[PDB]
Curated annotation (Swiss-Prot), chain A:
This is Thymidylate synthase. Pathway: Pyrimidine metabolism; dTTP biosynthesis. It catalyses: dUMP + (6R)-5,10-methylene-5,6,7,8-tetrahydrofolate = 7,8-dihydrofolate + dTMP. The gene is Tyms. The keyword Mitochondrion applies. Its EC number is 2.1.1.45. Homodimer. NCBIfam families: PRK01827.1-3 (NF002497), thym_sym (TIGR03284).
Amino acid sequence: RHGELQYLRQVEHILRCGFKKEDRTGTGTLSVFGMQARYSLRDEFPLLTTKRVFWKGVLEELLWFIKGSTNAKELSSKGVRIWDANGSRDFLDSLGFSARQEGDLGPVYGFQWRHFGAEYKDMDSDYSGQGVDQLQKVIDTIKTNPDDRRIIMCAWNPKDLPLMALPPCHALCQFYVVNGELSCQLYQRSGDMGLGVPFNIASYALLTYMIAHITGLQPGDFVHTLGDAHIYLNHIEPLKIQLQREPRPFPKLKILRKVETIDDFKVEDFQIEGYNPHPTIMEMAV
Amino acid sequence: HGELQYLRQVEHILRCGFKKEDRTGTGTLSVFGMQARYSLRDEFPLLTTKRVFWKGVLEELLWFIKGSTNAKELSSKGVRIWDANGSRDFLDSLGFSARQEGDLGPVYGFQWRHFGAEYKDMDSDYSGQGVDQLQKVIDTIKTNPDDRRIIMCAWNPKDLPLMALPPCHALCQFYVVNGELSCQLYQRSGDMGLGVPFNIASYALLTYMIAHITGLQPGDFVHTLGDAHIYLNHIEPLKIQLQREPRPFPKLKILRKVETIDDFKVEDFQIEGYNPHPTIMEMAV
Ligand SMILES: O=C1OC(c2ccc(O)cc2)(c2ccc(O)cc2)c2ccccc21
Ligand SMILES: O=C1OC(c2ccc(O)cc2)(c2ccc(O)cc2)c2ccccc21
Ligand SMILES: O=c1ccn([C@H]2C[C@H](O)[C@@H](COP(=O)(O)O)O2)c(=O)[nH]1
Ligand SMILES: O=c1ccn([C@H]2C[C@H](O)[C@@H](COP(=O)(O)O)O2)c(=O)[nH]1
């Protein structure tokens, strides 16, 4: 059974049993609270095929997280503009960060991952050795104590929340080792099923591939856990069309050289093989 | 019956979990990633195939809510579940020889009411310091029930080295639709035999309290697990438990109108109709 069917079953379940729920963007949703899917990472990569996923954005965003950057312009300069609106002059001013340069998102994911608890000044400051390097801690624990049941990386920081351009969505993840296989579970508090969730799945599956490579393990499962799983009201008709498509076999992800530390990965080390998504289809809520 | 969700998770681990050694040296059968949904509508999921220590559930939660990190304050209620982790021996093993007996460091109660504050010891006055996540959750439920960010997080990487134990029930999220309040817990590690039934009751209770404070009806408790495991010396006891038919879940009654979360007391709560099967299981250390 194709792993993508779990995602399609979730979409189906929301369209059939979700409740109408108003939301921040004013678009309105159909919503279910509490969902879980399991995507195998064993000799395949769960890049969804019934609608193309912006893989270049997935990879560049994750590398940007890993170097701890909070500058939207540093991601934009790679051709990936997904964070640009949240670092714009007008958006930053609406939140009262007039003293911030354009692009300064505040202490969002990459900062929390690499420097949790350090004091947030601006995006150009030097934070070397400041705060808790959760990402390296996870990697070290996987190597020395793979049975550990507390291998956690948490972007949800209640103290830093008011400094962030947006509150963390993919809020907490946990790693797990058994039978030589590394698995990862993401707690995602809020999931745009049509446009966001496929990207999120690829993002954390990639992270698991990267950490498995660094630690000499084989990728196991990505477990995707949702809080508010929702379909925006203007996605119902496109998704009903998407749901009639049969998934194509997932692609593979190849890592093209031996990499020793998480910081040393670069875009050219990765190749998605055999990705043949169905032809395109959706308006994004703001 | 909602207890079948728990029993089916136990069965799944017994049938499909992998052997995995663990911190305690006991060894486990283990599945990574599970989820169950327990309805809170007109019933309370206090498990029946084995008696749950409801007095400990209620008193521990009230102890969380007032922000205590002192195991002696819970013990004086006749609930000793935290006493070993506050003992001198345990504190000396972690490197806390300067801390007095009972001082658990900045565990759940501190994180829930004072996230980000500087911890000193269990006797300090933390009034107004840090983020009161618990009150923030209640306020947001009242003012913006559609909010998709209603989170209380006990996992604090900065404070982890100061805690007696790393938080197990690590983060929870609340959700409102159709006048019903739901809660999802992310529990990183679940002892299915002895811990999980207590965890379910604890967060089902928390949801009843907040619904009462906010004028809403309890909806679902969604229980999400990371390492869901059965200790190897629990296998035979649990196989007995799995043959027991569940009895209908008791009801939880709140005995007066309470206005703020800090004003609940033990006397305000009554469990009606709890007829569990006889208790059975050795505790990992
Ligand atoms: O701008 C974009 O943000 C999205 C994004 C998702 C996860 C992530 O890690 C980074 C970005 C996103 C999509 C839908 C939403 O409701 C909110 C955000 C996204 C996905 C695909 C293409 C563009 C975008
Ligand atoms: O001492 C006790 O800790 C338990 C407990 C669980 C959750 C909680 O919120 C508070 C306590 C527990 C049981 C098994 C474990 O592997 C670890 C802890 C527990 C459950 C039932 C009776 C006694 C105890
Ligand atoms: O990584 C992400 C970030 C955002 N979203 C979606 C979920 C919501 O539709 C919207 C975030 O809005 P709030 O939950 O914060 O209200 O974007 C995702 O699906 N994945
Ligand atoms: O609220 C709790 C606290 C602990 N445990 C169990 C899970 C593990 O069996 C053990 C904690 O050990 P570690 O996961 O931290 O190694 O206690 C629970 O089930 N619920």
